[PDB]
Design a binder for this molecule. Structure first.
Ligand code: CA
Ligand code: CA
Lengths: 126, 66, 38, 149, 54
C-alpha cells in the first residue's frame, strides 16, 4: 500500500499531497516535492529536521514548520533549527497568513472547536 | 466598588492567569473580577509576583542560546 | 455416526462461542455499572 | 496478596478445633469451621471438598491445607457475589431469570449487532432444566466453566 | 484480552461531560466592616471579596 501510494503520488495531477508519520525520516525513494509542512515532530532531533529538509531539495522549493506559541514546541523548534542555521539556512518567522478569512476553512466556529476537546481528551491512556 | 489594576493581554495569558487563580499558585484568589475575554481586574498589591510568573512562563519555552 | 458426531461437535463449538460472547457482554455491562454507579 | 487480617481469623478458626495444639483438626468438623467464618456450604459441596482434602484417608488436615481451602472458598464466594450482582443487573425486572427480552435489551444497550436467532440459540443453549431460559444456578454453572474472568 | 481492552474504554469515555468544576463563587451574606467596607465569602471555595459600597 505504501509503495503504490508513493508511486501514484508523483505521476497524478488529481492527487499531489500525502501525509507521513515518521516513516520518511530515513533515506527512501520519495519523489521530488516542492512544499514540506511538518507538524508536531520529535522533541529536539536536529537529525530528523535535517533529513526532512533533505527530502525537498534535489526559490524552486520551500518548506514550512508549524508550531504552537506559548508551548514546548517553541523551544523545541528553536533548539532543533540550530543545525540548519549553521548550514546557512535562515528561518523567516510568519505571524499572519494572507487571506486567512478569504475562504472557508475547518474549525470556523467555536462549536466544533470545543467539540474537539472531548475527542482530544478521550485518549485517557491509563 | 472595586479598586485595583486592569490588565489587558491576549486570551492565552488571560486564561493562564485564570488557571493561576484556581491553582492557587500565588497563595490566594487575588484574581477577583474577570470583565472581558481579553481583560482582567487584579488587585495591585502583588503585581510583581504575577510579572515574575509571566516571565518564567515566557522564558521557560524559549531555549536561550546563551 | 461420524456425521452425527461432527454435527454435535459443531453445535458444541457454537455453544462455546456463544458462552464467550455472553461473558464479554456481561463483563462489559458490569464494568459500565461499576463506572457509572449512582 | 490474599489478605492481612482475615488470615488471623482463619488461624483463630483453626485453633478453635485445635485447642490441644496438635497442629491438625478433624475433617468431620470442616462444616462447622466454615460456618464460623461465614461460609454456608451444602452437603454435596461438603462431601466433594472432604473427598479432595482426605484422598489418603488420614482424616486430619494441617494448617496449610486449611488455609489454602479457606482462601479458595473466599475467592469463590466473592466470585459468586459478583456473578449474582451481574445476574441482578441482567435481570433488571427482578424476574429471577435471564429471559430472551433481558438478553436482547442488554445486547442492544451494549451496542452489539447480535441477531435474534443467535439470542434464542444462546437461550436454548443456556437452558439445562428445560424451563426455556437460564436461572441463577445455570448462570453460576456457566460462570464456573467460563473461558476467563 | 487486547480485543476486550480496545472496546472497554469506548463506553467508559462516553458519559462524562463536565470535567471542570463550576468555579462560580456563590458568595453568602455580605459582612459589613468599617468605613462602609463589605466582604463577600464564597461558600464553595472560601474566596473572599472585599469592596466599598456607595
Ligand atoms: Ca428478567
Ligand atoms: Ca433455566
Amino acid at each position: 500500500e505504501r509503495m503504490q501510494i508513493l508511486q501514484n503520488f508523483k505521476h497524478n495531477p488529481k492527487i499531489n499531497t500525502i501525509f507521513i508519520s515518521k516513516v520518511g525520516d530515513t533515506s527512501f525513494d520519495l519523489p521530488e516535492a516542492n512544499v514540506l509542512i511538518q507538524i508536531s515532530s520529535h522533541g529536539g532531533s536536529r537529525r530528523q529536521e535535517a533529513q526532512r529538509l533533505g527530502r525537498v531539495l534535489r526559490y524552486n522549493a520551500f518548506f514550512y514548520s508549524l508550531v504552537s506559541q506559548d508551548t514546548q514546541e517553541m523551544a523545541y523548534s528553536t533548539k532543533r533549527q540550530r543545525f540548519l542555521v549553521d548550514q546557512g539556512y535562515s528561518f523567516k518567522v510568519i505571524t499572519k497568513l494572507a487571506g486567512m478569512e478569504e475562504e472557508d476553512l475547518a474549525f470556523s466556529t467555536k462549536e466544533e472547536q470545543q467539540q474537539l476537546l472531548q475527542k482530544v481528551l478521550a485518549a485517557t491512556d491509563l | 466598588v472595586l479598586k485595583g489594576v486592569l490588565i489587558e493581554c491576549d486570551p492565552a495569558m488571560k486564561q493562564f492567569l485564570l488557571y493561576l487563580d484556581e491553582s492557587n499558585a500565588l497563595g490566594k484568589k487575588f484574581i477577583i473580577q474577570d470583565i472581558d475575554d481579553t481583560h482582567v481586574f487584579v488587585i495591585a498589591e502583588l503585581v510583581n509576583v504575577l510579572q515574575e510568573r509571566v516571565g518564567e512562563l515566557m522564558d521557560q519555552n524559549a531555549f536561550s542560546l546563551t | 455416526a461420524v456425521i452425527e458426531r461432527k454435527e454435535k461437535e459443531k453445535k458444541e463449538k457454537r455453544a462455546l462461542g456463544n458462552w464467550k460472547l455472553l461473558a464479554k457482554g456481561l463483563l462489559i455491562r458490569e464494568r459500565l455499572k461499576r463506572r457509572y454507579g449512582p | 496478596e490474599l489478605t492481612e487480617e482475615q488470615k488471623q481469623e482463619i488461624r483463630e478458626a483453626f485453633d478453635l478445633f485445635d485447642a490441644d495444639g496438635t497442629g491438625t483438626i478433624d475433617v468431620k468438623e470442616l462444616k462447622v469451621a466454615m460456618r464460623a467464618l461465614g461460609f454456608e456450604p451444602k452437603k454435596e459441596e461438603i462431601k466433594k471438598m472432604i473427598s479432595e482434602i482426605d484422598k489418603e484417608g488420614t482424616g486430619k488436615m494441617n494448617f496449610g491445607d486449611f488455609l489454602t481451602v479457606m482462601t479458595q472458598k473466599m475467592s469463590e464466594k466473592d466470585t459468586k457475589e459478583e456473578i449474582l450482582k451481574a445476574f441482578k443487573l441482567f435481570d433488571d425486572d427482578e424476574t429471577g431469570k435471564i429471559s430472551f427480552k433481558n438478553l436482547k435489551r442488554v445486547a442492544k444497550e451494549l451496542g452489539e449487532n447480535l441477531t435474534d436467532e443467535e439470542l434464542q440459540e444462546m437461550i436454548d443453549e443456556a437452558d439445562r432444566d428445560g424451563d426455556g431460559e437460564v436461572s441463577e444456578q445455570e448462570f453460576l454453572r456457566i460462570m464456573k466453566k467460563t473461558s476467563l474472568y | 484480552d487486547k480485543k476486550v481492552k480496545e472496546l472497554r474504554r469506548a463506553v467508559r469515555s462516553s458519559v462524562w461531560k463536565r470535567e471542570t468544576i463550576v468555579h462560580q463563587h456563590e458568595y453568602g451574606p455580605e459582612e459589613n466592616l468599617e468605613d462602609d467596607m463589605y466582604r463577600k465569602t464564597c461558600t464553595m471555595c472560601g474566596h473572599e471579596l472585599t469592596y466599598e459600597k456607595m
